[PDB]
Amino acid sequence: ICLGHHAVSNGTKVNTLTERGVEVVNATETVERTNIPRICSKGKRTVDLGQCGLLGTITGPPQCDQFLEFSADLIIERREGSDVCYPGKFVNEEALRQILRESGGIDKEAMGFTYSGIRTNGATSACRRSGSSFYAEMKWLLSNTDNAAFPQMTKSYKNTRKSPALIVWGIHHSVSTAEQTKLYGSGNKLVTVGSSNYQQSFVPSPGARPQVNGLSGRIDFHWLMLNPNDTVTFSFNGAFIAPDRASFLRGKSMGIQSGVQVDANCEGDCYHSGGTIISNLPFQNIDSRAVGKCPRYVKQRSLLLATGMKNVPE
Amino acid sequence: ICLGHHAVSNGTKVNTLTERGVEVVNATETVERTNIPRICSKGKRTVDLGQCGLLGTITGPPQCDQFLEFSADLIIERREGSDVCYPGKFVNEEALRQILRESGGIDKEAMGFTYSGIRTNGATSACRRSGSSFYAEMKWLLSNTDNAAFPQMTKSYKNTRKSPALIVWGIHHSVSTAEQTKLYGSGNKLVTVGSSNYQQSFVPSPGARPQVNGLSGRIDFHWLMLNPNDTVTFSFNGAFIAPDRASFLRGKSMGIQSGVQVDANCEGDCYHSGGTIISNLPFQNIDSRAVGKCPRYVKQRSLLLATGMKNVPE
Amino acid sequence: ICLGHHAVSNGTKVNTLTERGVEVVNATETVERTNIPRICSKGKRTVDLGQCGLLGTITGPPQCDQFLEFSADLIIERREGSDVCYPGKFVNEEALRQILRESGGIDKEAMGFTYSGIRTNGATSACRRSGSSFYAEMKWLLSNTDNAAFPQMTKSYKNTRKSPALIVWGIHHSVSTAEQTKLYGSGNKLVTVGSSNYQQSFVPSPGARPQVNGLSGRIDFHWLMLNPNDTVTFSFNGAFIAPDRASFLRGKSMGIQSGVQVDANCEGDCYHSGGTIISNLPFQNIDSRAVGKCPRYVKQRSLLLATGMKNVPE
Amino acid sequence: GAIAGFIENGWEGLIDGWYGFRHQNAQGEGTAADYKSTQSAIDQITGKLNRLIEKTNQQFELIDNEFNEVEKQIGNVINWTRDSITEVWSYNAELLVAMENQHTIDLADSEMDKLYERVKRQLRENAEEDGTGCFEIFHKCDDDCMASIRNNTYDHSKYREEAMQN
Amino acid sequence: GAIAGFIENGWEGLIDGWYGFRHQNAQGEGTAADYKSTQSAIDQITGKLNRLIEKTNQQFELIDNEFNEVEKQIGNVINWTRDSITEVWSYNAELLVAMENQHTIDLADSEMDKLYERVKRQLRENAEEDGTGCFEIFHKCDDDCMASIRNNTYDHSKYREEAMQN
Amino acid sequence: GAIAGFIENGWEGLIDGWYGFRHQNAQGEGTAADYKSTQSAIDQITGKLNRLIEKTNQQFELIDNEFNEVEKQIGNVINWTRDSITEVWSYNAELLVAMENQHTIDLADSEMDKLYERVKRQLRENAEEDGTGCFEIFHKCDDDCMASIRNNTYDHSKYREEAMQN
Ligand SMILES: CC(=O)N[C@H]1[C@H](O[C@@H]2[C@@H](O)[C@H](O)O[C@H](CO)[C@@H]2O)O[C@H](CO)[C@@H](O[C@@H]2O[C@H](CO)[C@H](O)[C@H](O[C@]3(C(=O)O)C[C@H](O)[C@@H](NC(C)=O)[C@H]([C@H](O)[C@H](O)CO)O3)[C@H]2O)[C@@H]1O
Ligand SMILES: CC(=O)N[C@H]1[C@H](O[C@@H]2[C@@H](O)[C@H](O)O[C@H](CO)[C@@H]2O)O[C@H](CO)[C@@H](O[C@@H]2O[C@H](CO)[C@H](O)[C@H](O[C@]3(C(=O)O)C[C@H](O)[C@@H](NC(C)=O)[C@H]([C@H](O)[C@H](O)CO)O3)[C@H]2O)[C@@H]1O
Ligand SMILES: CC(=O)N[C@H]1[C@H](O[C@@H]2[C@@H](O)[C@H](O)O[C@H](CO)[C@@H]2O)O[C@H](CO)[C@@H](O[C@@H]2O[C@H](CO)[C@H](O)[C@H](O[C@]3(C(=O)O)C[C@H](O)[C@@H](NC(C)=O)[C@H]([C@H](O)[C@H](O)CO)O3)[C@H]2O)[C@@H]1O
Ligand SMILES: *[C@@H]1O[C@H](CO)[C@@H](O)[C@H](O)[C@H]1NC(C)=O
Ligand SMILES: *[C@@H]1O[C@H](CO)[C@@H](O)[C@H](O)[C@H]1NC(C)=O
Ligand SMILES: *[C@@H]1O[C@H](CO)[C@@H](O)[C@H](O)[C@H]1NC(C)=O
Ligand SMILES: *[C@@H]1O[C@H](CO)[C@@H](O)[C@H](O)[C@H]1NC(C)=O
Ligand SMILES: *[C@@H]1O[C@H](CO)[C@@H](O)[C@H](O)[C@H]1NC(C)=O
Ligand SMILES: *[C@@H]1O[C@H](CO)[C@@H](O)[C@H](O)[C@H]1NC(C)=O
Ligand SMILES: *[C@@H]1O[C@H](CO)[C@@H](O)[C@H](O)[C@H]1NC(C)=O
Ligand SMILES: *[C@@H]1O[C@H](CO)[C@@H](O)[C@H](O)[C@H]1NC(C)=O
Ligand SMILES: *[C@@H]1O[C@H](CO)[C@@H](O)[C@H](O)[C@H]1NC(C)=O
């Protein structure tokens, strides 16, 4: 009586510690290459920011009117998104994004700032609503008349909640020194900001910038996290974009950047801009910057795992 | 004659390349879970900073009077520690901490700055000693009289030693523009600082901050490492907290943050805030931020290593 | 008939999963220790910067006259190299270096800035050519006469190319407030800079610095990458070192820092300051900061791989 | 051990299992399959897959921005780090599979040798090793006696007397 | 090889060593232990522990602050890095132990098979393989002859003549 | 399996190959070498070297500066990272070699055992196992009959009749 093992006509070459291209009876892939070109979001509270930039949700340009108090497990940023209406940018912008991506969304709260001896309804054609408007969560403070001076004001806000308060403000940089005085009067303008953890100061800087959205002026946005029971104080004399409301983080979420469509028919936990990596495999060769819960990125296209003996034909 | 192997009634399940929960005769743990809730410091020159903040050892608030020239192998920071008496903070504070944690302690040296045409004994109730005092290693320079002007002064210090000199100074931010002139006179105040490697400048910024230690003013601390034979120069006209002494690093040390007590009865090289990890094991699941010489942090609670054959009972 | 295996008198001890110092018939080294003390550059377009600092290639001090438009696969920085003639430094200097190290070299282009109502031929004895000169790619703009005022000027440059334009400018910090007015007149001097991606501002800061190259003044260099079709605008009123030409990256290269000589007789892809690591081995114990395409750095001096059976002598 | 060694090839006809018996006697030729040897090898390969097909519960998020680039210096540190980790995982992956494949092959070779030497001991001097994985019978076993070998009931004494003579 | 295969179970009575002999003859029943087989397996397991229980001389210090948080951007890069390294070591650890356990088991199985086949060759045709790890004697060995087997002195010829007949 | 076990030592005289035969008969003493066993072991060790002597195409560049130090905070994160990766590769390297060496040794031991048991089956009852890797002949083989064993042509029946008697 003779015994032996099974074999096939066409086996699969795999690699071993000692051989390259040794044929086995059966093998299975270990590196994921199959991408689904959609954001698989089944069962997740998803917010597609679209034209609203993430930072815009805090300040409130017209594109973000529907996102002022969003709530999500999954936040999607889009290339077409803008944080701004009146040309400007955020100092420490990427830190703030990473904070907001995992915030679970934001909850707004009035800071109760009232004013006397100035204006507060400053607007622009860069922020279109009914007509010329401004950042919905901000207030553009000028001097009362077409010139005049700006009273050295002092505003404070105490965080009365058990969560850190995201505070944001703006420094306005006029096109000219003339424009700066036409708005807030002449002289050295100074904005000072401090908490029980923060310590900084700001000065405007009028000058000609290139035109963006039709305007050659810029607004400098700044932010800080105000701890519970801690107070922030704004000392200013012009060129100051005041916060109207503060922001609080709702909970927990994951934020991605993507160009593909949302799909509530598929579930996924590993995302990249080109879609969702749905896989049980330990490794992937699709995108090294995939985020969420993913197989490890490896540079190899393929790595076959033997699921059978060495294939030895007649 | 029949031969065989040994076996036991109750074995230990372990994991293999092919099986999960296979029972072997004997096994041993590979991941450390046992923490000792004390800072094991036997045979080490230890400094428990207590209420003195690490950065405070350079400037000298009252809490750090006993630590102005400390010498250590092991430095312990405490939560109750403060770097400050008069409210303020350090620019690039964490870099300086990491430097000081491994400094082996500091050695102070007079910089020999003398003055003419100003005051130098500025104090405050935030720095309590005999009465109102100041930072022991610093000097609060005002104008001679309750108002008056501040002469455009120039002070230089050359590092005469073979080691880099830690230089530190302060910018005082008054509560009001009025307070700023009451101290150093009116006009634009400017502090410029440069070496053969450094290049920066500073301006005060008066304004109302919230009250800390009873005061609404702040002091901005700045620092630089002065190379051997290189000279640093201070150009100033007010709002300037001058260094009285420079600092030199003693040698080598390790710095930790902790809330547990020192114990000179046990020896350890792996520390975390909750104590000392004493172990021979290659891995640990106690604290991923443990520092010193430690087993690798792994996320698994337990990983049993077979020290015996497969256990096969009757 | 008896069978067996081969053996030798003197074997090689190696390590296994279970034994340390087990002798095998033959073994081979796995960790590279052999360094060649030259920069192996056979077949590579190499630029040895020598006394020219890398950042100097953009601004043009006399040491970099021969490197204003270099083209390379391999860039070598030298310790003796300086980016500067008139004492000063670059803000964000190391980022710019890393950019330039892989730039493949630079291509210059006139920005076409013309002037009226000022001077433009400012020089110094720190920049020696025919006599007192300046940075070849920069222009030192003063006021027309030995005093006088500086007209609030506005210069713009649009990047007309498909590649990002490296723009660089300088802020001059005079020795005294007197010197600052002697050059650009009295009053607050302001330089503002913006693009469709950039947003910043600059002010001079006169004061006494220590003497470098004989001078106590400093020039602050700043830079930005101007995207294709995007425009940068300079708003200034003095203390401004204007760019004459912009820079464009040629392609791709690798940059190293080294103290050893170039050798076109040997080929290498793994470099460090002490030479070239030529090896097929998977690991190396020569330099952990070796760059290029290298074996992995390991801390072990030696790790012998068995290439033969266990050696069992009589 | 055995495998592609003294067994020069495998049986493409054996489609009922991994390991099987092929006999020849008076009643003709037949081929079966050993379930317990096949299942043991299969369950072990299965054990590898369950352990390698694995899910991480560790979430990672963006520290990078592909719409608006982060500052170069921090950008370069990030890429440098990401690439370093890529090298490590690419290495781990390649080694893991190569190591696992070496063991899978040897394991399947082992299970064959374990089956063979068990049949050799299942009988006695009632048979001798041909050398190529075959067992020459010196008492002419029939299709019922063959089944006794397959389901492990062949008596190593109740054919001895006869087989000893031959 | 052998182990939980043709040896259906182990002896909970054998407390003197890992591997041992259990005989039966005219003088009764007895059980001993083989030192050289036990010690070889033990010394090898010991060799694994000494190599795994290992000390790093690489010191790491804080780049983080749990009293006063560092800036978010650098904070996020640090955590991202730390977590990545955690994943690597968690992986390394799990694989190491699983790999080491597989080899430890096979090694202990190997040392048994090495002992068995050495006894089988220590005699000759003076005995035959029962199949379950037992050796049937055809010359009735006594407690002195058994000791000759245990301490490796049994003569594969000075019992042959007698045993051949049976 | 075999190796430094029942073969107490190796032959420093065998310089023609890794494995060889050493016989003694009427015509004297001789020693040869088995090419197919030697080449199989050699080709496998070679396969390990080709896979380990490996080239990365991943380029890394400076994120550090040894002429002018980068800022301390980012400097410390870089060193912390570099050191962490160093620990990983130092670990990987040490484990790789130790793992590979264990397998190399066992592989060379295996190829010997595969050769031995193939000769044992190349004959029949025409020879018996001495125990120390030697085969005692009971039909006195000569230098031509020995070559028949070496180049694998020895007949396991055309010496049987004679050898059975002895
Ligand atoms: C079309 C254009 O380029 N012209 C802009 C002009 O530049 C001049 C050039 O046209 C000319 O060829 O060359 C000149 C030099 O030789 C100049 O460079 O500059 C003016 C301002 O000096 C620009 O006017 C702006 O036009 C905007 C539309 O594009 C808009 O109408 C601006 O009005 C606003 C605004 O809507 O935002 C009007 C607001 O009511 C007012 N709000 C408040 C609270 O003050 C704002 C506000 O003053 C600014 O936004 C703050 O900087 O002004 C108008 O400024 C022209 O675009
Ligand atoms: C108790 C309190 O809140 N009052 C502070 C006051 O704020 C006003 C409010 O009380 C009031 O309800 O509302 C007002 C507006 O409507 C104000 O907000 O502001 C004053 C100063 O303007 C504070 O006085 C300080 O009190 C300190 C004790 O808490 C202390 O007495 C300060 O004196 C010092 C000092 O000790 O540090 C006195 C020093 O001799 C002097 N040294 C030098 C070298 O000049 C310093 C120094 O001038 C400052 O530290 C620098 O900023 O002043 C006193 O300033 C009051 O707390
Ligand atoms: C040798 C030395 O230390 N003296 C420098 C002097 O400091 C004084 C000390 O000598 C004295 O012991 O103590 C005093 C206080 O009690 C002072 O500290 O300061 C003067 C300037 O105030 C320095 O003069 C410079 O000398 C340079 C040579 O080392 C050089 O001659 C400088 O002239 C330049 C230049 O060449 O760079 C001349 C240029 O034509 C001019 N170009 C333009 C476009 O303006 C520049 C330019 O003004 C500056 O470079 C900008 O800051 O000046 C001369 O300034 C002396 O070194
Ligand atoms: C081939 O391998 C895969 C691995 O899971 C398995 O699912 C499949 O059934 C195998 N094919 C055969 C012939 O069994
Ligand atoms: C803030 O102040 C209120 C005063 O009633 C107190 O109840 C609350 O606990 C405080 N929060 C903290 C944590 O300081
Ligand atoms: C169980 O394993 C550990 C591993 O070191 C060992 O110390 C202990 O002695 C073992 N127990 C027995 C039964 O030998
Ligand atoms: C500093 O200057 C003194 C002058 O005597 C010299 O001895 C010393 O070596 C110098 N140090 C360095 C390293 O420049
Ligand atoms: C020893 O090992 C190396 C590994 O490549 C090999 O090149 C050399 O030929 C070996 N020496 C012998 C004796 O074969
Ligand atoms: C820049 O403008 C020119 C106008 O002709 C156009 O051809 C070119 O494509 C533009 N570049 C980009 C990418 O905007
Ligand atoms: C970082 O790596 C990505 C690819 O993952 C590359 O596209 C990008 O250019 C790199 N960032 C920098 C600073 O160049
Ligand atoms: C970094 O990780 C720690 C846990 O190790 C976590 O507590 C902390 O919140 C993280 N830092 C940031 C930036 O959130
Ligand atoms: C970083 O590590 C290098 C050695 O690789 C060391 O020389 C240097 O001092 C370290 N940098 C810092 C911040 O100390």
Q: What angle do CA D85, D87, D91 make, to 5 degrees?
A: 115
A137 & A276 share domain:
no
Task: Output the domain CATH number for residue B279.
Answer: 2.10.77.10
C78 & C175 share domain:
yes
Chain E: residue whose CA lies nearest to A297: E84
C52 & C118 share domain:
yes
Task: Inspect the interface and report whether the beta carbons of A17 and F58 lie closer than 8 Å.
Answer: no
User: What's the gap in Å between the CA of C292 and the closest CA on chain F?
Assistant: 5
Residue ending a domain, choose from A260, A284, A305? A260
Tell me if A231 CB under 6 Å of ligand 5: no
The residue segments making up the domain with residue A288 are 1-44+261-314
Q: Distance (Å, rounded) from C-alpha C248 to C-alpha C161?
A: 9
Residue E56 near chain F (CB below 8 Å): yes
Q: Distance (Å, rounded) from C-alpha C122 to C-alpha C13?
A: 72
User: What's the gap in Å between the CA of D49 and the closest CA on chain C?
Assistant: 25
Amino acid at D3: I
Amino acid at A211: Q
Name the nearest CA neighbour of B156 among B114, B212, B210, B101. Answer: B114
Closest atom of ligand 12 relative to the F70 alpha carbon: 13
A219 & A88 share domain:
yes
Q: Distance (Å, rounded) from C-alpha C135 to C-alpha C127?
A: 7
- The helix/strand/coil state of D160 is helix
CA nearest ligand 12 atom 8, residue: F79
Amino acid at A192: T
Residue B134 falls in which region: left (phi positive, over 0), alpha (psi -120 to 50) or beta: beta
Task: Inspect the interface and report whether the beta carbons of C192 and A173 lie closer than 8 Å.
Answer: yes
Chain E: residue whose CA lies nearest to B80: E67
The residues pairing with C254 across neighbouring beta strands, listed in sequence order, are C74
Tell me if A307 CB under 6 Å of ligand 4: yes
Q: Burial-class residue E166 by CB neighbours within 10 Å (0-12, 13-18, 19+).
A: exposed
Q: Which chains touch E (3 or more CB pairs under 8 A)?
A: A, B, C, D, F
Identify the nearest ligand to the CA of C164 by its number.
Answer: 9
User: What's the gap in Å between the CA of F89 and the closest CA on chain B?
Assistant: 14
Task: Inspect the interface and report whether the beta carbons of B19 and D47 lie closer than 8 Å.
Answer: yes
Instruction: Using the mean position of ligand 9's atoms as its centre, give its distance from the Cα of residue C160 in Å.
Output: 8
Instruction: Using the mean position of ligand 12's atoms as its centre, give its distance from the Cα of residue B49 in Å.
Output: 26
Three-class HEC string of chain B: CEEEEECCCCCEEEECCCCEEEEECCEECCEECCCECCEEECCCCEEECCCECCCHHHHCCHHHHHHCCCECCEEEECCCCECCCCCEEECCHHHHHHHHHCCCEEEEEECCCCCCCECCCCCEEEEECCCEECCCCEEECCECCCCCCCCCEEEEEECCCCCCEEEEEEEEECCCHHHHHHHHCCCCCCEEEECCCCEEEECCCCCCCCCECCECCEEEEEEEEECCCCEEEEEECCCEEEECEEEEECCCCEEEECCCCEECCCECCEEECCEECCCCCCEECCCCCCEECCCEECCCCCCCEECCCECCCC
B301 & B179 share domain:
no
- The helix/strand/coil state of E99 is helix
DSSP structure class, residue D55 = -
B72 & B166 share domain:
yes
Residue D73 near chain C (CB below 8 Å): yes
Instruction: Using the mean position of ligand 7's atoms as its centre, give its distance from the Cα of residue B230 in Å.
Output: 10
B284 & B247 share domain:
no
Q: N- to C-terminal Cα distance for chain E?
A: 30
Q: Distance (Å, rounded) from C-alpha E86 to C-alpha C135?
A: 50
The residues pairing with A212 across neighbouring beta strands, listed in sequence order, are A215
Q: Which DSSP string do the residues of chain A spell out, in sequence order?
A: -EEEEB--SS-EEEE-SS-EEEEES-EE--EE---BSSEEBTTS-EEE-TTB-TTHHHH--GGGGGGTT-B-SEEEE-TT-BS-SSSEEETTHHHHHHHHHTS-BEEEEE-----SSB-----EEEEESSSEE--TTEEE--BSSSS-----EEEEEE--SSS-EEEEEEEEE-SSHHHHHHHH-SS---EEEE-SS-EEEE---------BTTB--EEEEEEEEE-TT-EEEEEESSSEEEESEEEEE-S--EEEE-SS-EETTSB-SEEETTEE----SSEE-S-TT-EES-PEE-S-S--PEE-S-B----
C117 phi, psi to nearest 5 deg: 100, 10
Instruction: State the method.
Output: X-ray
Tell me if C28 CB under 6 Å of ligand 8: yes
CA nearest ligand 4 atom 9, residue: A26
The residue segments making up the domain with residue E152 are 1-166
D contact test, residue of F37, F49, F88 with most D CBs within 10 A: F88
Tell me if A125 CB under 6 Å of ligand 1: yes
C145 & C266 share domain:
no
User: What's the gap in Å between the CA of F112 and the closest CA on chain C?
Assistant: 7
Total domain count, chain C:
2
Residue D152 near chain E (CB below 8 Å): no
Instruction: Using the mean position of ligand 4's atoms as its centre, give its distance from the Cα of residue E53 in Å.
Output: 39
B162 & B204 share domain:
yes
Chain F: residue whose CA lies nearest to C304: F97
Tell me if B7 CB under 6 Å of ligand 6: no
Total domain count, chain E:
1
D41 with D105: CB under 8 angstroms?
Answer: no
Tell me if C12 CB under 6 Å of ligand 8: no
Resolution in A: 2.6
Task: Output the domain CATH number for residue F44.
Answer: 3.90.20.10
User: What's the gap in Å between the CA of E165 and the closest CA on chain B?
Assistant: 19
Of D5, D77, D86, the CB nearest to F74: D77
Q: At how many degrees (to 10) do helices D72-122 and F72-122 cross?
A: 20
Chain E: residue whose CA lies nearest to C19: E47
Tell me if C205 CB under 6 Å of ligand 9: no
A111 & A215 share domain:
yes
Task: Output the domain CATH number for residue B67.
Answer: 3.90.209.20
Residue D84 near chain C (CB below 8 Å): no
The residue to which tokens 């504070």 are assigned: B93
Residue F83 falls in which region: left (phi positive, over 0), alpha (psi -120 to 50) or beta: alpha
